[PDB]
Structure formats: C-alpha cells, structure tokens
Amino acid sequence: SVKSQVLEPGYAYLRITQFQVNTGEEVVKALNQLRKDNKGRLKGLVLDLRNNPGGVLQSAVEVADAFLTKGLIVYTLRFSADPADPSDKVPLVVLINGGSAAAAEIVAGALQDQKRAILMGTDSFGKLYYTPNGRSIQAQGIVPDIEVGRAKVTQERSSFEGFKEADLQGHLANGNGGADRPTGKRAAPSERPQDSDYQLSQALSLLKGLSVTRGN
C-alpha cells in the first residue's frame, strides 16, 4: 500500500498504490519513521497518488486527515478533518497521472481545495462525492492547477567537463578554510527515482522552489 523513500535531503517520498483498510495507520507510521529519518522536519513531500484506482472511504478520509488539520474532508456523510495530524505543515504537492480515481481522487481534492497542498500531475480519471469546496468531482473531475504531461527524461554524459578551479595547480585556498572539492571520477552511483520520470523531477524542483523563496 505505502512505500517511503528519502528522495533528497529534506524531501521524502510517499506513494499510495491502493487505499486499503488500515492504510491511514500505516501512512501515519511511514510519516513518523521518515520524520525520524530526516530529523524532525522535511522541506516538502511528494504524495504520489497516481495510478490509484480506488479504495475504502474510511482509508481515504483517514489519509487526508493524516495531513489536514481543519475543515471537512469529504462529503456527499460529512467527514471531518481532525486537527490531529503528524504532517506539521510540510509543503505538500500531490501527483495525479490521470489513473487516479475514487479514494485517491477525493484525498487529492481535499488536499487541493483546502489549499493544504498542490496538484502537479495531469487531469484525473474523473471518478457521488464533494471536495471540501462546494465543487463536485464525479461530474467533471479535477484539473491540476499546473499540468506536467507524463514524460521520460534521459541525461547524456559529456566526454569532458569544465576543469574546476580546484584542478588548477596552485589554486588559492578558500577564505573559510573548507576543503576544496576536486573533480575526481564522475559516475552516477545509482538511478534515483527523481531522474526516471519527468514528473518526479518536476515535483522536486518545484518543492525546492517554494523552499528557497517564500522564506523570508
């Protein structure tokens, strides 16, 4: 159901393939363990609620509560947003490839309409339920405020790279005294997921964007 991963320092990763019963408690546990992983605070999360067909409404509402504090989560049945949530207001962006529907769809709709998160994928599947906002979801579906068509990106290896100042003989040591970084061997140790599909890289870049600026 769940899977956690520290994509980059200060930016963890979550994925809810299906919204099964007890999924809320398990995602709470994942949140806690990743909070331990990245020392009590994350700069942003990427909830990968894509390719998610559906699930049990209790699961979806509890999952939404896991990140939302105030408001009504989803109604047709008026599910409330319990103020208790270990998220602690980590900037959340939700990914919707388009296969998202039902439980995932309502969770995304709540985390969007409450302005608690952002939707960065593509238009959802479109599968009555009402977001916390009066707008319906079944009739027309949810359009992400920013759309990133599914794409695959490949990086080429240049034969040579610019010889950094650390390479030149007799380069002046930095004033701070920190060790200069040489240009040793440059090979990718692993293919982290962010490089695989365009959407994950876009989401991480946008999350870093909201972290550098907007903080003043």
Give me the residues that bind a copy of itself (CB under 8 A), please.
91, 97-99, 115-118, 120, 123, 125-128, 130, 135-141, 145-146, 148-156, 158-176, 178, 180-184, 198, 201-202, 205-206, 208-210, 212-213, 215-216
Taking the complex as a whole, the smallest distance from the CB of residue 115 to a copy of itself amounts, in Å, to: 6
The rounded distance, in Å, linking the Cα atoms of 91 and 45 is: 6
Taking the complex as a whole, the smallest distance from the CB of residue 172 to a copy of itself amounts, in Å, to: 6
- Of 24 and 91, CB closest to a copy of itself: 91
Give yes or no for a contact between 112 and 64, defined as CB atoms under 8 angstroms apart. Answer: no
For the record, the structure tokens of 123 come out as 């238009």
What's the N-to-C CA distance of the chain in angstroms?
A: 38
- Of 37 and 180, CB closest to a copy of itself: 180
- Of 62 and 113, CB closest to a copy of itself: 113
Taking the complex as a whole, the smallest distance from the CB of residue 130 to a copy of itself amounts, in Å, to: 6
Give yes or no for a contact between 123 and 138, defined as CB atoms under 8 angstroms apart. Answer: no
Taking the complex as a whole, the smallest distance from the CB of residue 137 to a copy of itself amounts, in Å, to: 7
**Residue with the two structure tokens 């972290």:** 211
- Of 40 and 76, CB closest to a copy of itself: 76
Taking the complex as a whole, the smallest distance from the CB of residue 81 to a copy of itself amounts, in Å, to: 15
Q: Name which of 55, 111, 52 is nearest 85 in CA terms.
A: 111
- Of 158 and 190, CB closest to a copy of itself: 158
For the record, the structure tokens of 202 come out as 């876009």
- Of 99 and 193, CB closest to a copy of itself: 99
Taking the complex as a whole, the smallest distance from the CB of residue 7 to a copy of itself amounts, in Å, to: 12
The answer for residues whose C-beta is within 8 angstroms of residue 64's C-beta and 6 or more apart is: 73, 74, 81, 106, 107, 110, 111
The answer for residues whose C-beta is within 8 angstroms of residue 24's C-beta and 6 or more apart is: 58, 59, 61, 62, 63, 65, 66
